[PDB]
Structures are given as C-alpha cells and as structure tokens.
Amino acid sequence: LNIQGEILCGGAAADIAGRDFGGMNCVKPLAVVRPVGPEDIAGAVKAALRSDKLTVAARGNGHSINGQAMAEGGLVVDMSTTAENHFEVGYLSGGDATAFVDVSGGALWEDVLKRCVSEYGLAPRSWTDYLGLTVGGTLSNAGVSGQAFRYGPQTSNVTELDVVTGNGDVVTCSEIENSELFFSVLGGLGQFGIITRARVLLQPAPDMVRWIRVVYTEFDEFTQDAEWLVSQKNESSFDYVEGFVFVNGADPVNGWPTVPLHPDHEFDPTRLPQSCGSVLYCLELGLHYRDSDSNSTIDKRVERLIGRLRFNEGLRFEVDLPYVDFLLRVKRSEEIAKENGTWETPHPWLNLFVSKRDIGDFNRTVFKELVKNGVNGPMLVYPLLRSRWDDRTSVVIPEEGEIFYIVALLRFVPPCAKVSSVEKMVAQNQEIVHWCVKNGIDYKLYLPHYKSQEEWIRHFGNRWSRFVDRKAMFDPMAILSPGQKIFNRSL
C-alpha cells in the first residue's frame, strides 16, 4: 500500500497499538499506519479489502477498556497524526447553536476546547468528564457528561462528518447528505467507517463555573431531586448535573475525603445521621456565569436555585473556577491515580444505562451490596433525558422511560494487588450484567463489550436488523473495528 504517512511494523509502535486503558488485552497488529489524512486512511482500508485476512482499527487515544481499538494481525490507524487537519469556525443563524467548528476525528477534546476558547471565546456545549479523548472516539460511542440532560450527548451536537467507509469511499454526510451513513456512524462503534472530520456545535464560552457538591443519605430523595433538576425549563436551573455514590467512611480513595472541592473545607462526618447506609450519594451541580457578574448576585442566584434541594445540611461544598478549569477538572483525578500508581494498572470499568424505573433496584443490590466498599474510583450515577437522544443514530439506550440513568463503575487496581484481583473485578462486572438480565432490568451497556452473537442481538434488540443492514451497506467484508467483536471478518 502506497501512502504519504508512515507505516510501522513491530517494535514500540505495535506494543502501543496492542495496549489500551483497560490494560487487559494485548493484541498485536501487523502494522501501525500513521496517516496524514483521509487518503492514507482509505488506502489502509483498500489494502485490507484486497487481502484475505487484514482488518483495520482506528485508534483514538487508546481509552478503550476491552480491546475495541485493536486489530489482531491487522492495521491500526493512529489517528493522532491527523489531529491538526481541521479547524474552521462558521456561524449559524438558525438559532440554537451560535456556531460550529470543523475538527479532525483525531483531535483530543482538550485541544479543541482550548483553541475554541482562546481564539474565538466559543466552546462546544456537550462534553465528556475526561477530555483526553478523541472526537472520532467519543462520537463513535455517544460522549456523555453533565450537560447531556440539556443538549444531549456529543452525538447530538454534530451536524456533518467526513467518513472513510469500509468500502474505502471518502464520503461527507449529514442529516441531509448521505444521511444513512451519518446516523450509522454516530454511536456506531467504528463499524461503518472512520470519522476524519466532525462539524461540532459551539456556543459562547462561559467565563466561570460555580461547582457545587451536596450530600444525600436517602437514594429516593437524591434521585427525586436530580430528576426534578434535569426536568426544569431550559436555562431556569443548572448547566451541569451529575451524581456519584461514595462509601460512608474515611477511605481516602472511596469514602468521604473524595467529596470536598478545596483543601480548606473538609467533610465533617458528625453531620451525618446515625442511620446512614454503607454508601452515601453526592449531587454535583455547575452554574455558568460571567466575569462581570456581582458575587452577591451570583450567591443569591445559587441560594435560590439550590434552595428547594433536600440534601443534608452542613454537607454542601462549593468552589468557583474558570470554565476551562472546570471542564478540565478530572486532570486532578488523573494526577491522584498516577501518584498512587493506579493509572498504569488495569481498569476493568463497567459503564451502563439503567431506566429510571429500575435504578432503585440497581441501587439496592449493586451500590448497597456488591460494591458497597467502593471500587477504588468513581461510581457515577445521574439522570438523562431521552428527548435529547436521536433514535436514528446507532446509540443504544434503555427501552422505556423519558428519564434514564447513566452509571459508571470506574474500577482501579492497587499496584500491589494480585492478578486474581482483576479477575475478580471482571467476574463481578459479569455478575452485575447477569443479575440485570436475570431480573429483567431495563439496562444497556455503554461502551458495550460482548463476545457472542446472542448477546449483541439482545443488546441491539429491535435495532439489530438495522445494525446488520447498515453493516452490509458500509462494511460488508467486516474489516472495521474488529475488536468490537460484533461482526467477524469475511472469509
């Protein structure tokens, strides 16, 4: 194959393309392709199509948990070498979003953020918690954070893509042009093509965020309050709503020390009622405001907005920081992980959506029993609104209810733990999924990983035939993102 970029066989390049953040799969490619642009990528795709066995996997920033960006004896396309290929801002008169920016599928969101803000005072309006992820990587899944209840996930905030299809075609698509490909690729787990450019929506960048954390002991009250907040009329409430479960104890990694937002206000556990469960709940809120706003005016606004919430008195923590610093807040957690050596150990992360109707049951068995001593990392749980998620996309969410929850068990492995430790974590993730399937819980995995056809058929449900149809159209040989394990390469 003749390309402008570099082709690397074996060595450190292959080692890296055979690793991901999951830290549980090592699958080496024949070669790593470092493309200059869409032509190098379609070349890689066409090479694989001519061969008997080659497959092609785009690699974003290697944040997958279960080998989804790996290609056993295939070609891994390191998208980072395309990270700077696009940066064009345009305006929108159609109301809603102010503007859009064209960015590479290989750009990291952290870089997109910094450049939009510094050059234009604009920024995307829907995020992930962690910004060391690629545009094409998150758009291939959903891209979820505390703004999604208001604007939908990142797949709801893109209006055009350039895609290199599994046929090797370079195609521009949108709601109006090649719409089937557009909707297929969004949330499509890399199955239908490689995103080389995305037109991402922009709004004016806020100056500041008031970041608030308040604590609940009662899951019913926590979820009622959170659902109420995400259901409020546009711009009458907060601009970010998340939640998390924490251990009722002093464990610095799992317990109440994880709650405070600055070193000068600590968690006082004597404010907790005597009857508290094994775990407690934190509602996390963000209010955007202007540099010019009077502090008393903002204080009064926040007291009004928080004033009906039923959190435990004396367990309210807040800080104010620039908007960019708020969006990059998880850098602090990355630093704690590198310090305790758990950034480089395996991460058997479990991510799923649960209907509003079943989140109570999930809390009862999962949070209050299975992981009641924590998982050594975040246990996130917060509500989302179905109205913001377009069902034409490949994304798969729970079957019933206008509100559903996202849940994340962000497991970390202490560096002196046995390999049996990681096995036990994986086994417990499986035990949770089984418990869901057995008890008819309306759940769907996010970043799903299954190895059997019957599990994928169950996952896609009434959208399985559509998924298969889209595959037959855009990657009939099944060469793309084989590590998702949904389709096996054609013989």
Ligand SMILES: *Cc1cc2c(cc1C)nc1c(=O)[nH]c(=O)nc-1n2C[C@H](O)[C@H](O)[C@H](O)COP(=O)(O)OP(=O)(O)OC[C@H]1O[C@@H](n2cnc3c(N)ncnc32)[C@H](O)[C@@H]1O
């Ligand atoms: C590591 C991690 C992940 C993460 C996170 C925090 C950490 C530390 N926080 C998230 C969050 O707050 N909200 C959210 O929705 N996701 C969060 N993630 C998970 C993350 O989205 C996934 O890891 C995702 O895969 C993006 O990561 P990355 O950009 O590194 O992409 P990848 O893992 O290498 O590839 C994922 C799949 O998509 C295919 N792929 C990669 N690039 C493309 C392009 N450009 N076009 C089409 N497909 C692509 C890969 O082959 C793989 O199948």
